[PDB]
């Protein structure tokens, strides 16, 4: 059977490495999260109305009178947060174990990451709260950076002089349509990978030890799905407002602006970098590079060993990178004042210097220690 040929081969008998840890669960979790988001998003779309006239209320109605509608809305919000948690851990697995040498898979990945960030940004604009409106204006105006092409482009997205209904409705359309493009790009992501097979934490050729996927990494993915569902629900049913922001529960006032404005947690590392660079344009570029530096990552691998299991100096540099990523996430939250700014400036300098300079030099030193260089 043509389909079953595709199925069994791809989902049941896919020779997989026998020794991949729980981190390799995370990408499958991302796919599940995508489906969960789509399903919850569809059940938000049967009652939401893009009109700036009824948006806030539409959402209120969603969390007040729509049957179990509060459940689906907070599942959607905390599932976006769970999506970004699993995305960050997936990218960290790819950075740590040398999986970026699968270059086409890595590039389709960073395209997926850009698409997911754009989808989450427009989705956060969608409830039309105080925080959504000022957040949209703010980094939309970020686009106003480009000197000749930027200004017009901004109002083009804004569809007018300033974000207003024109934006909300087109942001609803784009936020609806992009997760299906994300699903298609994820299918391309899976294809570009099966051509090469998954990597293992030792970083070695695992062709001598491969097992089926149906009984070994399926029940493992089911267990990971169950644990991820435990964390999501316990972040919806018990702590539903933990990851959100209180000022989004006020209606969008163009005349007032929330005093303390901040992007959601996931977009902060970038926020910090942007704020750090004095020049507006510089910030925008660095911000982009922040995400793009990853794509650049497969050309910076100067070691003869694929994984970091046997590479302790680059392990130390990797955990310092995770450390100042957490620092940049914290700084974004902090307001503009001493000494948060300096940390932000250093943390950004250290982030770019560790990824660009320190890891290939450390890999050269590690190759010299094993009498290889």
């Amino acid at each position: 059977h043509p389909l079953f040929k595709i199925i069994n081969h791809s989902f049941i008998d896919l020779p997989a490495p026998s020794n991949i840890s729980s981190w390799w669960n995370f990408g499958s979790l991302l796919g599940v999260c995508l489906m969960v988001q789509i399903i919850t998003g569809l059940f938000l779309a049967m009652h939401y109305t893009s009109d700036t006239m009824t948006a806030f209320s539409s959402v209120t109605h969603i969390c007040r009178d729509v049957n179990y509608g509060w459940l689906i809305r907070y599942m959607h919000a905390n599932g976006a947060s769970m999506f970004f948690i699993c995305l960050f851990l997936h990218v960290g697995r790819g950075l740590y174990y040398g999986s970026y040498t699968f270059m086409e898979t890595w590039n389709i990945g960073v395209l997926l990451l850009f698409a997911v960030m754009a989808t989450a940004f427009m989705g956060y604009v969608l409830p039309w709260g105080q925080m959504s409106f000022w957040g949209a204006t703010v980094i939309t105006n970020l686009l106003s950076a480009i000197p000749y092409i930027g200004t017009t482009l901004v109002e083009w997205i804004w569809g007018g002089f300033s974000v207003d209904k024109a934006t909300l409705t087109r942001f609803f359309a784009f936020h609806f349509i992009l997760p299906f493009i994300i699903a298609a790009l994820a299918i391309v992501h899976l294809l570009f990978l099966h051509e090469t097979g998954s990597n293992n934490p030792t970083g070695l050729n695992s062709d001598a030890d491969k097992i089926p996927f149906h009984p070994y990494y399926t029940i493992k993915d089911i267990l990971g799905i169950l644990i991820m569902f435990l964390i999501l629900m316990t972040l919806v049913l018990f702590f539903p407002d933990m990851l959100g922001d209180p000022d989004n529960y006020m209606p969008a006032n163009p005349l007032n602006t929330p005093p303390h404005i901040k992007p959601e947690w996931y977009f902060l590392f970038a926020y910090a970098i942007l704020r750090s660079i004095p020049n507006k344009l510089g910030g925008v570029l660095a911000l982009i590079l922040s995400i793009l530096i990853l794509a650049l990552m497969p050309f910076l691998h100067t070691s003869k060993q694929r994984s970091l299991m046997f590479r302790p100096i680059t392990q130390i540099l990797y955990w310092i990178l995770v450390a100042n990523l957490l620092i940049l996430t914290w700084i974004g939250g902090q307001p503009v004042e001493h000494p948060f700014i300096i940390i932000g400036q250093l943390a950004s300098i250290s982030y770019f210097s560790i990824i660009l300079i320190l890891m290939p030099i450390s890999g050269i030193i590690e190759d010299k220690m094993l009498k290889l260089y």
Partner: protein, 238 residues
């Protein structure tokens, strides 16, 4: 720079602690008799109460208590009907400007989601309503202002609305300023999340189901993976 309201041991705070639902009853009475003159609980309709702290027929009573005129009329441009169960709570100062006019140009924010919209709302609310202390030296609030250490800027247009024994609780529980601020904070909380109780029941069922299902799925995984985890490899070059 703002005073950060402390943590009060709110009853509903407990993981499985539902809203009193007895207190709320009192709190609303507080909103209906005091807070409804300036603030608008736009997203809470009389029907909403049924099932929380007022029974169907009982709610009908309250609904009728107020009057609601709808413009659509055969020839008239309105018809006044005592509020029905479906009617939403009556907002005063129809236009915000009305409110500004009389509130020193300060719009009483809808207290529908105030607790959710204010950082540490339940506490803030309690603190603000009870934080009407003496202004310090050097402070010069503008005309029509009052001093509350919590409110952003410490200059809230709202005058202190809860004077001890401001209103009498029908239940008879002494109407001390605090007993009133705690009740209205519980109610506003309920308002901002009418499903608080239902959810926590779902969370309890979720914890019981995950405590049943996680070791069993772990046992199935460790069954299927035992085979390999016991595999013994031996190299036997000829």
């Amino acid at each position: 720079l703002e005073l950060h309201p402390p943590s009060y041991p709110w009853s509903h705070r407990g993981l499985l602690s539902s809203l009193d639902h007895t207190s709320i009853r009192r709190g609303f009475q507080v909103y209906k008799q005091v807070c409804s003159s300036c603030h608008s609980m736009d997203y809470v309709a009389y029907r909403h109460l049924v099932g929380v702290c007022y029974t169907e027929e009982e709610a009908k009573a309250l609904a009728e208590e107020v009057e609601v005129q709808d413009g659509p009329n055969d020839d008239g441009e309105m018809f006044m009907r005592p509020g029905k169960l479906s009617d939403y709570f009556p907002k005063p100062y129809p236009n915000p400007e009305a409110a500004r006019a009389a509130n020193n140009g300060a719009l009483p924010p809808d207290l529908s989601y105030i607790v959710r919209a204010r950082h540490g709302g339940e506490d803030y609310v309690f603190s603000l309503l009870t934080g009407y202390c003496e202004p310090p030296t050097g402070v010069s609030l503008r005309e029509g202002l009052y001093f509350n250490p919590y409110f952003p800027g410490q200059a809230i247009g709202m005058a202190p609305p809860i004077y001890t024994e401001v209103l009498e609780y029908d239940d008879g529980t002494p109407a001390t300023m605090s007993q009133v601020a705690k009740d209205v904070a519980t109610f506003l909380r309920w308002a901002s999340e009418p499903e608080h109780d239902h959810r926590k029941r779902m969370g309890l069922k979720m914890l019981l189901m995950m405590g049943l299902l996680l070791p069993l799925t772990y046992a199935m995984k460790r069954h299927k993976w035992s085979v390999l985890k016991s595999r013994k490899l031996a190299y036997r070059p000829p």
